[PDB]
Amino acid sequence: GAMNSSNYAELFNNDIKLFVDDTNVYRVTVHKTFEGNVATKAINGCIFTLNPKTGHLFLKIIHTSVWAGQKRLSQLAKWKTAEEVSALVRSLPKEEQPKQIIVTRKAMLDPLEVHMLDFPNIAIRPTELRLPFSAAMSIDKLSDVVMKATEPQMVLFNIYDDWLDRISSYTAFSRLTLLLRALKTNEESAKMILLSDPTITIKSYHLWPSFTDEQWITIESQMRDLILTEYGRKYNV
C-alpha cells in the first residue's frame, strides 16, 4: 500500500525497491510570442529513479525531441516515464529487478502499472511522504548532464557519494532528503551553505563536497536552520 512515516524503515531493508519521480520529466519555459500570446519551449528533463538503500541513481535523460509533434504532453510525460522505467527494469538482471516501485506522485500509478503488466510480482506503490526529489536539478552535476544531452541518454550516479562507507542507508537517505529539501525551499542559500568553504571540494566522481564527519554535522544543522527560517517567512509564524 501507500508509503508513509509508519513503514519508513522498510526503505532500508534488503528488498530491492526504487523510487521514481517524474517532476522533471517534462520541463518548459513560458514566454510571449510576437503577437503577444503565450507559448512554451521545452527543455531537457530527467526521470529520477533511485534505490534508497544503495544510493544508485538511474538518471534517464528526456531529450526535447521526445515531445516533437505530440499533444497533451503533461499526460504523455507520465506514460513516457512509465515506459522508460519498465524498459529499465527489463534491462536489469532478474536478481537486480525491484520487488517494489514507489512513485512519488499518484498520477504515475496507472501508467506504470499498465507498463508493468509483464511484471505482476513487482508492486507499484504510492506514497504519502512529501519527498523533495524535484530539487534534483538543483544538484549542479545532474542539471549539467541533463542540459547538455543531445540525445536520449541514461546516466548512472551514486547519489550518496561514498557516505555509506561511514553511515547507514537510513542516515544517508535522511541527509539526502534534508539537502534536497533545503535546495528546494531556498536554492541560493542552500548552495551557498555547501560551497562557502573553497577548501572543501567535490570529487570528480561525486555530487557533493567531501565534508568530514564533523563538517556534515555543521552542514546538516545549517540546512535545518535554513528550512525552519523559510517556514516562518512563508507563513508569518
Binding site: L76, D110, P111, V114, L117
Partner: protein, 300 residues
Amino acid sequence: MNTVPFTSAPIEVTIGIDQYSFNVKENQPFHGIKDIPIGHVHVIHFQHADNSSMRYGYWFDCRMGNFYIQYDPKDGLYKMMEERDGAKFENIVHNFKERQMMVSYPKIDEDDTWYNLTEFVQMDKIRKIVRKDENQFSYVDSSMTTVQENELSDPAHSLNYTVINFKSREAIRPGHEMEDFLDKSYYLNTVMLQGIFKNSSNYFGELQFAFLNAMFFGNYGSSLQWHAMIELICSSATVPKHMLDKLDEILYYQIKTLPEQYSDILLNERVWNICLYSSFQKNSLHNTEKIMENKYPELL
C-alpha cells in the same frame, strides 16, 4: 400465454415475476402465475417474510418446457421444477385456473418495459453464465459471487460473467500501452465484440442480464459487471453508431426501472459521471443523460 403453477405456498413470501410482485401469506391458497407472455425470458423470484436477506429466483423461458414451483421444507426455499409429463401438467394448470387460484401476469398493453429490459437476453446465454445443465431454468440469488470476484470459493455456484479488466494484458496491447488504456476501442471491438461475444447483441444481452440480477437480487458482482460493460463502451473512441443508439435505449429503461430508493448502491458514481460527462461517448447517451439528471441529480 403460458402458466407457471405453484404446488402450494407454505411460508409467507413476496413473490416477483419480472418487474411485478405480490405478497403471499403463509398457507394462502396461491397456485401460480398465468398469462405469462411467450417470447421473452422471465424471472420469478422470492423474498421470505422472515428473512429479508437472500432474495432468490429462477430465470426461465416457457418455450423450453413446463415449469413449476414447489416449496421444499428441507432446504427451506421455493424450488423451480420441470414437469416432463405434458398431459399431467395441462391438467394441474387447467384445474387451478378453473378454481381461479392464479394471478395474471399483469401486463399493460402499452408497456414495452420488459421487452426493453430483456431485448438481447437469451436463455441459452443465461445458462452459460449460470452453469447447471441438468435444469432448463437458472437459479440466482443475492449472495452468489462472480468468476472475477472468485479470482480475488465454490465454482459450482458462480456467475461466469465475461471478465473485463482495464489493466490486464488482454486489455492492453504491447507497444500501445498508453493508447489502449486511454482508448479501449481495441479491447471493445477486437477482443470483446469480435473475439469473445461475437456480436453486439450477445454483449448487450449479458449487460442486460447483469443489470437485472443486480436489480432483482441486489447481487453486488452483477452490478460490478454491468458497470464494467457500460464503461468499456463509453471509454472507446470508436463504437458502431448502432451500438451507441441501442445503448442509450438500454440504459434508459434500466435507469427508468430501478427503484428510486436504491440508487446509492446500484449506481456507481464514478462510472456514470465518466460515461455521461467525460468519456468519448458523453454526447451519445442523450436519453440516458436526460433521465439520470431529472431523477438522480444528486449522484451527479
